[PDB]
Design an enzyme around this catalytic site. Structure first.
Site, PDB file in Angstrom:
ATOM      1  N   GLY A  20     137.176-105.775 -25.580  1.00  0.00           N
ATOM      2  CA  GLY A  20     136.822-106.550 -24.446  1.00  0.00           C
ATOM      3  C   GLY A  20     135.121-106.772 -24.383  1.00  0.00           C
ATOM      4  O   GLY A  20     134.581-105.950 -25.266  1.00  0.00           O
ATOM      5  N   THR A  21     134.913-107.989 -23.720  1.00  0.00           N
ATOM      6  CA  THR A  21     133.462-108.529 -23.763  1.00  0.00           C
ATOM      7  C   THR A  21     132.749-107.801 -22.803  1.00  0.00           C
ATOM      8  O   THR A  21     132.984-107.606 -21.609  1.00  0.00           O
ATOM      9  CB  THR A  21     133.662-109.909 -23.790  1.00  0.00           C
ATOM     10  OG1 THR A  21     134.348-110.380 -22.613  1.00  0.00           O
ATOM     11  CG2 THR A  21     134.141-110.430 -25.158  1.00  0.00           C
TER      12      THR A  21
END
Lengths: 232, 245
Positions: free
Chosen positions: B31-32
């Site tokens: 994820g970011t």
């Protein structure tokens, strides 16, 4: 099956060319006893609507909470909401129309008379009635409760029909609602001297005026009344 | 690690771990990048929202979401699983509002979220959550910032990180504490939030990102949450561009 325990009486409203007025006395009358003072009927919702609520103060509070969650509902999942899918009076009215009916169908009536007044973001004057029989109607002028019988004719001089809206201005409309109040103060028991008056305009925005006092006071004709009918 | 213990989020290994719960943190790494910066009079949220190609509509995609109106959440990890958790957060807030007639305190909010995540690591037919949530806001007890792990575990944080760029993030965050023992007031923390996402992106230097900064500030939003938008945002962009070069 609820019955009214404490009740507000009378919200008056009218249309004028660039927006609307909604106004009402501030009172929570516990029947014959004038129980509560400073009770505020008019709740701003979004910023382009004031919803006024008369009837059971007990049902009012509950409606106030639902109204606050509608504002909160609009914020949720929207990148913005102040002109994207901004909250209109009409949306609010429809959300209320549905729940008063739904409750009416379960036989526990929200015991209220409600006027939603606002302006749309389309430039359109909005002013509409819902109540506890779940009856709805749109009309240029409205009033609830005692004030339907009493004060609404007087406003109907000022605007009969929907082609005298452009010939009525904001100073004149304001004048008419306050003379309408004066009369509710005199001739209605569950009407206080205290009143709030909100002007929603599509140009001026929201003006909420609190704690105005009835003036143009006539009592000086009273010393000439002697007796009940026959008495010197 | 070994065989077994994996398959169902209720089985223990010998070691006293549960591989499924461990597997849930691993998922957030991909994820970011997300950060939180706590402040003496605010909180700042910033997030790295990766743009896959120049086809995307700019400023129209967010992972920052609101709860009630005073609580910020931003998630890293899997986007839609993350949505679900925030949905539930709205439910938590809303229920509190009815009963008590007041906005959730932040420790109240942390408790109920922390249980919902824990329940979904408790059964056999459930699945463990795959999202972290850096979250917090400002309340009648001052500012608080929390970071919720996929296990059902949370703690308070003065500056928090999770996502791909979280090693760059924590490192900087720690730096922030040394230079600023006073912890930085809310205004300068917007600009500063920017610089951390720009650094975190030297491990995410693949594709472009859109810098979205929001805040909730006691002094400068009146304890309510709002996005930072327009010229305020631009200033934060320009500072970050300068100091990275």
């Amino acid at each position: 099956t609820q019955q009214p325990i404490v009740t507000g009486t009378s919200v008056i409203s009218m249309k004028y060319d660039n927006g609307v007025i909604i106004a009402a006395d501030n009172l929570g009358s516990y029947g014959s006893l004038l129980r509560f003072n400073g009770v505020e009927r008019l709740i701003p919702v979004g910023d382009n609507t004031v919803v006024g609520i008369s009837g059971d103060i007990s049902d009012m509070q509950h409606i106030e909470r639902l109204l606050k969650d509608l504002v909160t509902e609009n914020a949720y999942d929207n990148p913005l909401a102040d002109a994207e899918e901004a909250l209109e009076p009409s949306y609010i009215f429809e959300y209320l129309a549905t729940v008063m009916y739904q409750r009416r169908s379960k036989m526990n009536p929200l015991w209220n008379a409600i006027i939603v007044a606002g302006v749309q973001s389309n430039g359109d004057q909005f002013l509409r009635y819902v109540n506890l029989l779940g009856v709805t109607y749109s009309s240029p002028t409205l009033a609830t409760g005692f004030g339907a019988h009493m004060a609404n004719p007087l406003l109907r001089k000022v605007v009969d029909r929907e082609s005298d809206i452009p010939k009525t201005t904001v100073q004149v409309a304001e004048e008419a609602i306050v003379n309408a109040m004066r009369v509710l103060y005199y001739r209605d028991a569950r009407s206080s001297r205290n009143f709030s008056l909100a002007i929603i305009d599509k140009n001026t925005g929201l003006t909420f005026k609190k704690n105005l006092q009835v003036e143009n006071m006539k009592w000086d004709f009273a010393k000439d009344i002697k007796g009940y009918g026959t008495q010197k | 690690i070994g065989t077994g213990y994996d398959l169902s989020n209720s089985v223990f290994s010998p070691d006293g771990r549960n591989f499924q719960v461990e597997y849930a943190v691993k998922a957030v790494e991909n994820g970011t990048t997300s950060i939180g910066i706590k402040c003496n009079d605010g909180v700042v949220f910033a997030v790295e929202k990766l743009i896959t190609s120049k086809l995307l509509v700019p400023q129209k995609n967010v992972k920052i979401q609101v709860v009630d109106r005073h609580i910020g959440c931003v998630y890293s990890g899997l986007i839609p699983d993350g949505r679900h958790l925030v949905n539930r957060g709205r439910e938590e807030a809303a229920s509190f509002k009815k009963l008590y007639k007041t906005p959730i305190p932040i420790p109240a909010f942390a408790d109920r979220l922390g249980q919902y995540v824990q329940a979904h690591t408790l059964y056999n037919s459930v699945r463990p959550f795959g999202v972290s949530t850096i979250f917090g806001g400002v309340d009648k007890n001052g500012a608080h910032l929390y970071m919720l792990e996929p296990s059902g575990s949370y703690w308070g944080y003065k500056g928090a990180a999770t996502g791909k760029g979280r090693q760059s993030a924590k490192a900087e965050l720690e730096k922030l504490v040394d230079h600023h023992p006073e912890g930085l007031s809310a205004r300068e923390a917007v600009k500063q939030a920017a610089k951390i996402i720009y650094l975190a992106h030297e491990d995410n230097k693949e594709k472009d990102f859109e810098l979205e900064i929001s805040w909730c500030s006691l002094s400068e939003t009146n304890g309510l949450h709002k996005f930072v938008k327009g010229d305020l945002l631009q200033e934060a962009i320009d500072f970050a561009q300068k100091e990275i070069n």
